[PDB]
Structures are given as structure tokens and as C-alpha cells.
Amino acid sequence: KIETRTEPMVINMGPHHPSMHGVLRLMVTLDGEDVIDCEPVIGYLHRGMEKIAENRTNIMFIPYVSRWDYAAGMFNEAVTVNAPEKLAGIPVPKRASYIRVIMLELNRIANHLLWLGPFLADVGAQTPFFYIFREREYIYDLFEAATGMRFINNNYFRIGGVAADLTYGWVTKCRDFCDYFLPKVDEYERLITNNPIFVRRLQGVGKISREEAINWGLSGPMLRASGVKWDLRKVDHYECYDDFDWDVPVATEGDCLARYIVRIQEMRESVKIIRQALDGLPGGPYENLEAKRMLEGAKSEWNGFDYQYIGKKLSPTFKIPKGEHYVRVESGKGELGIYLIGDDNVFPWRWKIRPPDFNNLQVLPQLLKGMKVADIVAILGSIDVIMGSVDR
């Protein structure tokens, strides 16, 4: 039966795991309340995306990609179309890059809203768990308008640009949402910084130093939550992100409270980059741009190489050129890299997905050292994992 011994007790967190960040299994062993070790068992969602990719052309594989970081969506499609387009030297127009910045920043907000909802219920108050769904459902319809389905399987990113231009009443509908959402961002900050029962669950709980974050290898709002200031939209001048003014959010504490505040402040800078991109959009609204192509349709400043959504409509039999390559995209939860090497055929020779969720999860044994049983979910909920990006 179930006896009562004196050695430390190992509890299996189980692959069931009723939480929204996938199927993780932790064999955390307890010392009454303190944990002394924890091994994460991953790969419950290992489907083999690096083996599929060697038998898919790029337009066959673009539907596959927005399932690793399925919280984000088009952050996976960002790296995937970037890997042959920065290897073949295919120019993306400036309008297609500006829609990519619009789509990636709305994905980073929706990635952060999907992290925040579970995390607020993990740390306490679960009444905002039902009101951050509604905030994400507005971004769901900005993706359903422009692209197809809802939040993933939205084949928007292409090699020469983007799949199609925006709809007609679209830019005026972020400006209805992104001006309504930005009041609610500060509501989320004053949920945890005020009510100081939550600050005693998040100060010093899962504290990782700056020197051990670079060694263990982290990225995004978990590296930058230790005062590292390393953002690959600023470090690599990534596709017209350098045309905007926005400050990389850091925190010099390392704890879970610092990791919380950087992510909410990354929502705030995301709407900042959004509003600088809607006004700096080359054709502006699409119906404003489509009208200029009807009044001056022969040869205008519009209908050029820019002011359009695709550079060249590439064939399905687009051969990747030969050569190694490593492409970074600053995802919502870190660096999503892929290590593309191709031969002259249309399939890549090796497609190594370097996930952000992978390298941030290997410190979770180390962060669960001295913490309590109730703090285990507060650590794992703050690393912002998506099992599926971890496992692939």
C-alpha cells in the first residue's frame, strides 16, 4: 500500500498535467516542503518536425511550422520563410516587411496574453483568467481577417514577402483594439505590484543570476529579466525593426517578479512598435493604396517594388541554394533559431529547429532548488514554455 517512510518523497507531476503549456512531466522529489531535485521528462509531443522538413518543400512546410510555438503562431513562420530568403538573397519589399512587423508584434502580445492568463491563476487570482481570453479573441479576429483560420495555421509569411495584403477595415481596427488594449496592460501590472500577497510569491522565487543565464543559455524575457538587455530585434537589425523607437525592457533582479514585469512591459513596447508601424506603413491602409493604383495605374510611386505584399510570386519548385545558415527571430519567449543547410534540391538537407522554449526549460531543475511545493507551478508558469516547441 502507501506506507510512511522517512526518506525524501518523489512525486510524479505526470504527463497529464492540466495546464495550457502542453504535456510536461516532472519527477520532482520533496523534502517535506522544499524540493531537492527535479527532472523534466519532455518529448511527449515530439512529432519529428526536423525529419518532416527534409521531405517538404518550403511551401509544403510553411503550414507545418506554426505548431512548435503554437502560442505565438507566426513567429515560427517568421524564421521559416527567412531561412531561404536570406540565403537566396531574395529581396522582401518594404510594405511586406511592415506587415510582418505588424503581424509579429500582435503575435507577441497574443503570446504574452496566453502566458499571463494561466500565470495569474497559478499565482493566485483566477478571475483575470477569463478576461485575458477576451483580450486575445480580438487579436484572433485581426488574424482571421487578414490571414485564414484563427491564431495558428495562418499561412501569411512567404519567401518573397507576405501572402496577401491586409483587408479593408483592418488598420482602423487595430486602432480600435490597440488603443483599447493599452489601458488594460497597466491593469495587469497593478494586479501583482499592488496586492502584496503576490509579491511574496514572486520575489526571490526562481532567481537566476545574469552570469548563469548566459551560461545556461536563455533568451527573451527570461534572459532580459536578469538585466542582460539582449534583444535580437535590436541586436540584429531585423527587417525594418530599426525604423522605430522602442526600449528593450530589462530588470536587474532575476526573480519571477522581474520575469513577470518584463513580459507585461514587452506588451507595452509591442503596441508602441505597432502604432509606429501603422503610421509608417508605406501604402498605409490597403484601400488607400488600392485607390491610388486605380487613379494612377500606369506607373506611379505606388505599384512599385515596394508598396506591395510580395516581391515575386515564387513557384512551388523553388530550389533552396546550397550553403549553411542560421536565422534568428526574437520570439515572444526567446530566440527561435533554425539551422538550415540545403542542397540544390527543393528539400532542405538538415533543418534544426533551435527553440526558445528548449533552452529556457533546462534551468527549471536549478530554479526548483530550495523552493516549496506551491512554488513549482509558479516557476514553470513563469518560464513560459510551450511543449511542442520544447519537444517538436
Binding site: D122, A374, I376
Partner: protein, 53 residues
């Protein structure tokens, strides 16, 4: 004050707010109401509303 002593102590023995039977902290699997299904769980389900009333 004694109404407030009764009110916090009653809800800490019947309600759903100060209750770790939802194992959202994962201190257990689902608490003591884990292996209970069917008519025995109905006593754990509906008998926590007799205790609330």
C-alpha cells in the same frame, strides 16, 4: 468582528476559495477527491453545497 471570524472560518471549511482540492499548485494530483467517481463523488460534489448552505 465575530461575524467576520465566523465568515472566514465557515468558508475555509465548505467553499471553493481557500481550498487546495483544486491542485493548481500541483501539491497533489487532485486532492482526496481524486479516485472518487459516480455516486460517491456526488456526496463530495453535492455535499459541499449542503455544507455551504
Amino acid at each position: 468582528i465575530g461575524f467576520l471570524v465566523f465568515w472566514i472560518a465557515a468558508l475555509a471549511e465548505c467553499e471553493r476559495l481557500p481550498f487546495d482540492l483544486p491542485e493548481a499548485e500541483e501539491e497533489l494530483v487532485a486532492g482526496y477527491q481524486t479516485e472518487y467517481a459516480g455516486m460517491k463523488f456526488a456526496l463530495f460534489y453535492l455535499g459541499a453545497y449542503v455544507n455551504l448552505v
